Enzyme design. Sequence first.
Site, PDB file in Angstrom:
ATOM      1  N   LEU A   1       8.741  23.401  -8.829  1.00  0.00           N
ATOM      2  CA  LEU A   1       8.660  23.144 -10.259  1.00  0.00           C
ATOM      3  C   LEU A   1       7.647  22.034 -10.506  1.00  0.00           C
ATOM      4  O   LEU A   1       7.431  21.187  -9.636  1.00  0.00           O
ATOM      5  CB  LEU A   1      10.027  22.752 -10.818  1.00  0.00           C
ATOM      6  CG  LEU A   1      11.119  23.822 -10.778  1.00  0.00           C
ATOM      7  CD1 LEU A   1      12.304  23.413 -11.634  1.00  0.00           C
ATOM      8  CD2 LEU A   1      10.578  25.169 -11.221  1.00  0.00           C
ATOM      9  N   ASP A   2       7.015  22.053 -11.676  1.00  0.00           N
ATOM     10  CA  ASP A   2       6.116  20.967 -12.033  1.00  0.00           C
ATOM     11  C   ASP A   2       6.791  20.018 -13.021  1.00  0.00           C
ATOM     12  O   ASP A   2       7.977  20.144 -13.337  1.00  0.00           O
ATOM     13  CB  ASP A   2       4.798  21.514 -12.587  1.00  0.00           C
ATOM     14  CG  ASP A   2       4.920  22.020 -14.009  1.00  0.00           C
ATOM     15  OD1 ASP A   2       5.260  23.206 -14.187  1.00  0.00           O
ATOM     16  OD2 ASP A   2       4.644  21.243 -14.948  1.00  0.00           O
ATOM     17  N   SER A   3       6.017  19.044 -13.503  1.00  0.00           N
ATOM     18  CA  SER A   3       6.589  17.960 -14.298  1.00  0.00           C
ATOM     19  C   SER A   3       7.172  18.467 -15.612  1.00  0.00           C
ATOM     20  O   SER A   3       8.199  17.961 -16.078  1.00  0.00           O
ATOM     21  CB  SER A   3       5.527  16.893 -14.560  1.00  0.00           C
ATOM     22  N   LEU A   4       6.529  19.460 -16.230  1.00  0.00           N
ATOM     23  CA  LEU A   4       7.012  19.956 -17.513  1.00  0.00           C
ATOM     24  C   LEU A   4       8.343  20.684 -17.361  1.00  0.00           C
ATOM     25  O   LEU A   4       9.205  20.609 -18.245  1.00  0.00           O
ATOM     26  CB  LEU A   4       5.961  20.861 -18.155  1.00  0.00           C
ATOM     27  CG  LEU A   4       4.665  20.159 -18.573  1.00  0.00           C
ATOM     28  CD1 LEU A   4       3.878  21.010 -19.552  1.00  0.00           C
ATOM     29  CD2 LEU A   4       4.947  18.786 -19.160  1.00  0.00           C
ATOM     30  N   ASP A   5       8.534  21.389 -16.245  1.00  0.00           N
ATOM     31  CA  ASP A   5       9.833  22.001 -15.982  1.00  0.00           C
ATOM     32  C   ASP A   5      10.913  20.944 -15.798  1.00  0.00           C
ATOM     33  O   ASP A   5      12.049  21.123 -16.249  1.00  0.00           O
ATOM     34  CB  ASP A   5       9.756  22.908 -14.757  1.00  0.00           C
ATOM     35  CG  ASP A   5       8.830  24.084 -14.961  1.00  0.00           C
ATOM     36  OD1 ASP A   5       9.132  24.932 -15.823  1.00  0.00           O
ATOM     37  OD2 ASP A   5       7.807  24.169 -14.254  1.00  0.00           O
TER      38      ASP A   5
END
Lengths: 459, 54, 347, 98, 88, 320, 49, 55, 104
Positions: free
Chosen positions: E42-46
């Site tokens: 997952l990335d930061s926005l997730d």
Amino acid sequence: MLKIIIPTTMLLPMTWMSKHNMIWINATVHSLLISLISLSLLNQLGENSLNFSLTFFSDSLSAPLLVLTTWLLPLMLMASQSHLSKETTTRKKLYITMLILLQLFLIMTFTATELILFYILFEATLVPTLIIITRWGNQTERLNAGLYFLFYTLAGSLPLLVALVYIQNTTGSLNFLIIHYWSHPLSNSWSNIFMWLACIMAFMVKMPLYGLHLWLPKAHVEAPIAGSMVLAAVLLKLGGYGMMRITTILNPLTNYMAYPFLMLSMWGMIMTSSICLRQTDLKSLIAYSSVSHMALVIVAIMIQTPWSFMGATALMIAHGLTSSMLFCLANTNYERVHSRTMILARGLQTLLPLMATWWLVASLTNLALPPSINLIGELFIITASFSWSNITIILMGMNMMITALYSLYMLITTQRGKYTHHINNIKPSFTRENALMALHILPLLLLTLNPKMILGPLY
Amino acid sequence: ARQWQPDVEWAEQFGGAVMYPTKETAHWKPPPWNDVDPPKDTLVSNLTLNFGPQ
Amino acid sequence: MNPIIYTTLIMTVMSGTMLVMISSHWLLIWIGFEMNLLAMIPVLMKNFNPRATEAATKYFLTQATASMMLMMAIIINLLYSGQWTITKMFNPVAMTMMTMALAMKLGLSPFHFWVPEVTQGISLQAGLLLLTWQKLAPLSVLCQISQSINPNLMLTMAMLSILIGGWGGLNQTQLRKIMAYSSIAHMGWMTAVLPYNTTMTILNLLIYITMTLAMFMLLIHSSATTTLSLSHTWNKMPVITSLMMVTLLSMGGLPPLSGFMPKWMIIQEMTKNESIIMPTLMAMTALLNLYFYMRLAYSSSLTMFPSTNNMKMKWQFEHTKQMKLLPTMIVLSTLVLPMTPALSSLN
Amino acid sequence: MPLVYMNIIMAFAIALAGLLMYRSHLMSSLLCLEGMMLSLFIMSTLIILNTHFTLANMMPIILLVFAACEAALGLSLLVMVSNTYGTDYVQNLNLLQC
Amino acid sequence: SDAPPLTLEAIKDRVLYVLKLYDKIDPEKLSVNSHFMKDLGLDSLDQVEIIMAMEDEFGFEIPDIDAEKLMCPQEIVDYIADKKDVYE
Amino acid sequence: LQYGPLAFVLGERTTRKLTETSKVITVDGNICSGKGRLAREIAEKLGLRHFPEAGIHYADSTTGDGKPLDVQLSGNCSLEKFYDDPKSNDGNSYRLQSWLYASRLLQYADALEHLLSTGQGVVLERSIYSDFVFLEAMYRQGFIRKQCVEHYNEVKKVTACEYLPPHVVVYVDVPVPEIQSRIQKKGNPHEMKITAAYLQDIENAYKKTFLPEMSEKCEVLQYSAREAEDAEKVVEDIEYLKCDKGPWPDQDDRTFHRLRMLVQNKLEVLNYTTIPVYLPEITIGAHQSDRVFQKFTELPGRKYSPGYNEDVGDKWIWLK
Amino acid sequence: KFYIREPPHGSPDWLKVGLTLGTSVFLWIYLIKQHKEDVLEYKRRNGLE
Amino acid sequence: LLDLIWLETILPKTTSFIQMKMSIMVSNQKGLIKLYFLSFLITIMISMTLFNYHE
Amino acid sequence: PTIRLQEDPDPEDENLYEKNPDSHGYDKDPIVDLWNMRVVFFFGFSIVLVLGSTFVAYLPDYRMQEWARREAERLVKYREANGLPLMESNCFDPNKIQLPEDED
Ligand SMILES: CCCCCCCCCCCCCCCCCC(=O)OC[C@H](COP(=O)([O-])OCC(O)COP(=O)([O-])OC[C@@H](COC(=O)CCCCCCCCCCCCCCCCC)OC(=O)CCCCCCCCCCCCCCCCC)OC(=O)CCCCCCCCCCCCCCCCC
Ligand SMILES: CCCCCCCCCCCCCCCCC[C@@H](O)O[C@H](CO[C@H](O)CCCCCCCCCCCCCCC)COP(=O)(O)OCC[N+](C)(C)C
Ligand SMILES: CCCCCCCCCCCCCCCCC[C@@H](O)O[C@H](CO[C@H](O)CCCCCCCCCCCCCCC)COP(=O)(O)OCC[N+](C)(C)C
Ligand SMILES: CCCCCCCCCCCCCCCCC[C@@H](O)O[C@H](CO[C@H](O)CCCCCCCCCCCCCCC)COP(=O)(O)OCC[N+](C)(C)C
Ligand SMILES: CCCCCCCC/C=C\CCCCCCCC(=O)O[C@H](COC(=O)CCCCCCC/C=C/CCCCCCCC)COP(=O)(O)OCCN
Ligand SMILES: CCCCCCCCCCCC(=O)SCCNC(=O)CCNC(=O)[C@H](O)C(C)(C)COP(=O)(O)O
Ligand SMILES: Nc1ncnc2c1ncn2[C@@H]1O[C@H](COP(=O)(O)OP(=O)(O)O)[C@@H](O)[C@H]1O
């Protein structure tokens, strides 16, 4: 009768206008003088009462009670002034005011001709006692005790009021002379049964009858010394006086309805006497001995014979004197060691010999040693009960053996043995305490030479 | 050698909203010292209107 | 609020009560009730403090519903007999409606719910007014129609009021709610004897009013609305706490105090009508009131609660405005029993 | 009694039941109060007209006047409550308990 | 009465229920100690979306700070326990 | 005729007494500043009554004879001991702070009563509005607990809401090293133990909170140490203010009637200072309460009402 | 002495004192006269004197 | 068993328990007019039926 | 402070014998205490106890015990002289009793 009431009322302004260091002296002197004046009521007739006026009357039953009531006030003042030393002037005056108001209410209660006035005064006696207990008691239980004192009594006496105003609506009068002369039998019906119960339970709670006695070991223990003295000596006798008065209109129903109370008294005598054997609190032991003694008075009033009434009167007066003395004797040690535990301070006869003599005499009167008037009342009640039923001798006799057991035990635990080592603040007895014990015990022994003065109207 | 008098632990029994606290009633709070509750700052919305272009 | 407006509103309240008590026409009695309510609503809101708004709204709703029921009872009575004079209410359904409406106006159980809330919501002076002056008009109307009151309904409501006041007072630490429950119980005592003797009702009302005035003026003098606030008074004014304890004893009905006179006078009356169980139940139920008066006496006068440091400042200042009728009120609420036969002056 | 009389009495009973059963709005209860006043006016007027009680003809008018004083009173309170909560819901009147 | 005495097990169960309600995570895979970036990709926005879902679930504002570190379910449980003052 | 509703009904109003010079003025500043001298000169120039800063024994100076009473019967706190042991375990710090807040409340009531009864303006050093700056510095230095701060805020919430804030707020700003030097030169052995952190916290409370929320209701005049000694400049600066931000012009005659009925009857002013909140620092047991109250009553002129004490020369008592 | 002048002081309010004493004396005189007239009227009605 | 337990249990402790329970039941009202006005409606109907319909 | 309030320590009791070795236990003031002792002793032992007991001892016979003994002596003498029974089983004359009509 006003020649006693009015000086008692004048005690109040005298107390409130007295100097800060003279209240005890003035109160003691004038209460003693009122006792001297009240002695004149002992001149009783052989046929009818002393009817002073439409409101007040004196009788061979109420004259000794009045004399005991007036005599107790100087003793309460003498016993109170030691533990109220650090008290402010206005609060000492309020305490003396409570005692004076209690005495006035008791004097008016014992002479009221009308049953509703008697009821009103017999209820007015609750307020000063409650104030004394809940304001000048020492422990946090004094609040709870006060509630037990307040609601045990009222719950019994509120029906009585309902009964009293009922009777006046059917007979037309509550005057005791008219009530006695115009007596009619009580028929056997449920309505009459409940009228009997309403006229009796109020006095039974005050005795107290075994079963409804729980308020007494709280109130007497938690109250200050004067409170306990007045509670044991006089306030218990209100129930006996009320029952002896009101049993006139209850016949012949009393022949049937006395059985549960007779069984309760004859068994609770044994129960309370046995409880006294295992009591860690000395004041509580004295309080329970009071219930054991008053059960005999209940029995005597229930069986309704002249000998039983004579015994009830004599026992009531003798118990008042003896129990007041025992409470004072316990308080003397309490003000030394500041604990009511009996086994805390031992061997006190070594350190306080004359107070040990006082203890011995009080214990001897408690166990009904002949020819003390305690023994006279007890033996008259026992003879009347034996006539009522021979088997009663089994219980009464048992009570005697138990009564001597917990009395001398109380004497041995506190006076004999060896002193406790760490208690080193036991000061020599004061003249105030010795004189208080002497003024408790001397009239008790003097009444032996003239017992007919405490044998009531049936003599 | 001193007569017992009430302390803070004794006095605190009479400081609640009710004499006998109950599971549901224990969440009741005593009234404010003055009978003034905090002002309920309710957001009274303003009407938003388009004036023009027609 | 302006002092002149306050004075005119108080005058309007007393004028409505007087119009109720001097009228022989049902419409004028209803108008007096309307005027009393109209002038009474702003008196409860003299200090804004939104709890007073809640109290005024509840009081208005209750009293207006009662007024509507009263007018319907009047109209039904007129329908079944073209009569406007206040008399024995020829129709029984109208009589039941009027009994319920007057019970709602007085606060008898089970219409009692509004009294503790309204009393707690308003200031002490407003509570004094609500618990003393507001009882006169419905009781005066009930005394005029007593010969037609169904004893069963009225006695049921009276017993319910005594029981509910006694039980509700036990759980209260706020002084105003304690006063409200005391008021409910005394209302029940008042209406229990009404079908048998209205002089006893008037006597109980007078004794209750003087005792309530004494208690409310004492709670105003020492500005305490809770038990813990009243527990500080001994360290500032011990005399006030002592007099409060004596008044509390009197309100419990203990002889030889004044509060014993009504109950004693009611039970006796009820016994002359062959009512035995009812007075016994009422007398035993009053012990709850006695208990929660005694608890307050314990907290305020018979024991000393801990105080605060700032109380020392208060030692340096005196009560500025004095209530002139407080000593007379205390004396009348305690030391009056020997003058009991004077009740014959009330009939 | 004719059917009109019991119809008016039924209207009064319905309005009383409506007042005694709150939903949310205080204004709805005030409307029920006005309806009760109206039913009382109609009933009293019918009784007075039927029996030709001439003086009593002024009675319903007076009954109207003190109706308005009750409405204007209630509306006033509805303002103040609203100013405290932004809403005339009766659920917000719960600061004081029993 | 008010809300019941919520426990740490309740916090963990609610957190895992919310996480398994996310579309970008396979339900049977994630564990309590699984990192959002490394294990789940997952990335930061997730992570920001997950934190907002937690805010909706538990009803209290988590600032931008003190949210950049809640990187597995376990630290989320620790944060909720610290904020709500629960220990057992 | 004491003022009341009857006097309001027949005539007397307060708005007629105000003649543009009412101007309740408070002159705040840190410890050992020049605010006292500046306030005295302001009151002299403007013809206003000056109220010296309320201390522990302020209430004594207004009741009986103005002589201070024993510290046991009045205050029960010591500022010298607070400097000696700010973290004492007997609760001296918050007891002193709470007593000082009560004294400031009483002095504000007295000043408002004077202004509303005579129309003449009043000058004060500090007030109930600036008292908290001493509390916060006490809390930040670890001298009091959080519960004491909550109790202080409870007392302030139900007391300060009944009064009108001052028209003019004068602040004298003196840096921490300069007041430290002034304290050292002053010579008071107890006052020299004040840490620079304490003074810095007082300044931080004054600048961060007090002045910003005082300036949103009325103009605030800040001055330095050197220009505070020029009292005529400050006086004309006050003279040329434009007071249109406070609630004082928004006051009617009925509001003034309520305020004047509140400022007299000091028992109602001090009503909520003794709320039944039992903190150890200020709660006193029943035995000590009784002993100290009895000791207070035995004072020569405190047993009865002011006119009924035969032992201070009151006469004709039997006819009053 | 005292800080505040205490206007109610060694000189009592003589108007109030005079009014109080006058009210008491007038009430006592009225009661005495009323009792006298009541006794006379009662004896007149009952044919006693 | 008797003095400290059962004699206490029957008369005074039972009385205190019952009175406390009844007090809690009576005074536990949230203060919502919607509830006790419905109570008023029930009371009015009961009075109209039980007492008024049998005179 | 781990204490809940500011309270005085519990003071230790005062021994009246410390300042007054002959203390009598009535009051702190020696003169007041001595006069309290004297007044109690005089009015309790000398006045009420002695004079009251003497007064009660010599109370006149208002109970009529000697009178009853004399009347009994006279009746016994008369009845033995005439030979009548000493006591009668009926206290009321049957000639003044009106019993109901018949036994059934
Ligand atoms: C069976 C026989 C027995 C019968 C028993 C009868 C019942 C027994 C008693 C019933 C219960 C009593 C309850 C009393 C309620 C008190 C409430 C109250 O006022 O506040 C509490 C009050 C508050 O105390 P506080 O906190 O110190 O005061 C702060 C202020 O409130 C702070 O507020 P403020 O700043 O605004 O101050 C204003 C202040 C200062 O006041 C002023 O400044 C005065 C200025 C004057 C203003 C000018 C106004 C004129 C214009 C208005 C015109 C209106 C016309 C209306 C008529 C319309 C007609 C349709 O005024 C007041 O405070 C209140 C004013 C009271 C005025 C009373 C007027 C009476 C009206 C009578 C109407 C009847 C007329 C005939 C009807 C005909 C039918 C239609 O406390 C007390 O007052 C103590 C209690 C005293 C009660 C009396 C005790 C018992 C009575 C004994 C007397 C003898 C009675 C028997 C006589 C028999 C006949 C001879
Ligand atoms: C803890 C201490 C408290 C104080 C104790 C007080 C004791 C009070 C008890 C009163 C004693 C007698 C009361 C009534 C007399 C007889 C009662 C009954 O048991 O006897 C039979 C009564 O018959 C039936 O049994 C009816 C009674 C049954 C219902 C009563 C309940 C008894 C259960 C025990 C309750 C506990 C009492 C104490 C409450 C706490 C007699 O048979 P019967 O010939 O037909 O009736 C004669 C009576 N007449 C003349 C009026 C007709
Ligand atoms: C706590 C004790 C009660 C205190 C009550 C207040 C005390 C102050 C006195 C009040 C002054 C007002 C009464 C005197 C003015 C004249 C009264 C006259 O104008 O009215 C008469 C009425 O006179 C009054 O009723 C007499 C008032 C006397 C009140 C004292 C009785 C208290 C009860 C006994 C307790 C002992 C307390 C004694 C004082 C210590 C007309 O009678 P009537 O219109 O045809 O009947 C009205 C009622 N009806 C129609 C329903 C029958
Ligand atoms: C420390 C040293 C101790 C040992 C050394 C002492 C030396 C010896 C002293 C002891 C004397 C022994 C007594 C022996 C008996 C002789 C006295 C007797 O004769 O008097 C009695 C008299 O006693 C009195 O009657 C009893 C006194 C009454 C007691 C009342 C107490 C005072 C009131 C105090 C208040 C207490 C409250 C009590 C409530 C009821 C006889 O009664 P009575 O047969 O008739 O008289 C016949 C002749 N009469 C009738 C003409 C008079
Ligand atoms: C410490 C607790 C003590 C408890 C004390 C309570 C016991 C009192 C016993 C009952 C009291 C009520 C009696 C009322 C006074 C009697 C007057 C009377 O005679 O009225 C009866 C009425 O008698 C009754 O109605 C009484 C019924 C009972 C009602 C209240 C119940 C109280 C509890 C009763 C059972 C408990 C009794 C023993 C309790 C012992 C203590 C535990 C008949 O009158 P009339 O109607 O005119 O009949 C002739 C024309 N038909
Ligand atoms: C209904 C539909 C409405 C549509 C409205 C659309 C609104 C448009 C708003 C446009 C605002 C911007 O672009 S804001 C500009 C955003 N650009 C940057 O941040 C540059 C650096 N990029 C990164 O750091 C990462 O790739 C990053 C992607 C941030 C992930 O961050 P994490 O590594 O920490 O997870
Ligand atoms: N609210 C307060 N809290 C604690 N101490 C205070 C408070 N107010 C004044 N003081 C103390 O009173 C002393 C003198 O007051 P201050 O205004 O600083 O000097 P001055 O008024 O003599 O110019 C100082 O030691 C100051 O700390």
